[PDB]
Amino acid sequence: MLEAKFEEASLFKRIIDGFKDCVQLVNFQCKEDGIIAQAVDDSRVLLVSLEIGVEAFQEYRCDHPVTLGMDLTSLSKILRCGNNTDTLTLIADNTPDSIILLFEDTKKDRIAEYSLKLMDIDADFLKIEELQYDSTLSLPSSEFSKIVRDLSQLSDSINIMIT
């Protein structure tokens, strides 16, 4: 019986960007300790994995695990109704057929109820992270962003080297 409220629909709008562009479908597993989500790209070379904790919502309540696999392309449409700083709220029932999305903003100003019809997607969660990796680096995300962006002009295959 899920009711999960983002203080600003921008966030979730952003997160779904990550999946869009490289994965069609995704199961969402809602739990009493928040949401997590997994999707594998089509060529099984890329896995997108998402974890969102209770502390990330304005309010969160989900007294019972529920899975929602959803068409991302569908869901994003619904997310354009977003305006970016409205209060988004996901809601679901015991056995869910539709998840309801619910935006409103400053006061009773405006309110907009949407439903996304859910689909049966088979849950094959992967647990692929290793304990030890050869190397680890962090760097400004837009620096990285820039590099990948430039070298993509020259070549289909960027190659990384650490020493």
Partner: protein, 166 residues
């Protein structure tokens, strides 16, 4: 009041205290919700490294400020290349720490040298996660898919991407 405490992985943890609150207490707190003991911790505000005896107001600190926190390891060359028909590209980066604004710093721990290639269409998808975090963590290995990771305020978004064989 509240301050911002920025670590060198895009993480911005929140933290509340009192001017009277010493430089030995702040850094102990931090360790108390992000795993790093304060030994591994350096803060610097206004390029001044803070000291474990002085006082937050000493360093003139007020509310809604932004402190830089650094990593002190008790313990060289990242290269990116793309090379093909029309020509070839090369960006070379080295681990450093910035002073004015350390959130730009490059951290690196290398356990073994790594030499790996990845499809660019995949990386192009991946960098979209910029919009969720200042910083990105990247983990490479010959024995497994490389991890790319943007952290959220409580949670994260991860991309596992397998290197190419040939």
């Amino acid at each position: 009041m509240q301050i911002f405490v920025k670590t060198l992985t895009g993480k911005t943890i929140t933290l509340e205290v009192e001017s009277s609150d010493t430089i030995d207490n702040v850094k102990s707190k931090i360790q108390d919700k992000e795993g790093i003991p304060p030994d591994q911790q350096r803060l610097i505000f206004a390029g001044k490294q803070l000291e474990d005896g002085r006082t937050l107001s000493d360093y003139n600190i007020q509310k809604e400020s932004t402190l830089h926190l650094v990593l002190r390891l008790r313990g060289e060359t990242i290269k990116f290349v793309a090379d093909g028909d029309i020509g070839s590209g090369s960006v070379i980066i080295k681990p450093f720490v910035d002073m004015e604004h350390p959130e730009t710093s490059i951290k690196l721990e290398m356990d073994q040298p790594v030499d790996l290639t990845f499809g660019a269409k995949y990386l192009l998808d991946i960098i979209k996660g910029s919009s969720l975090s200042d910083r990105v963590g990247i983990r490479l290995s010959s024995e497994a898919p490389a991890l790319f990771q943007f952290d959220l305020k409580s949670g994260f978004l991860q991309f596992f991407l397998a290197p190419k064989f040939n």
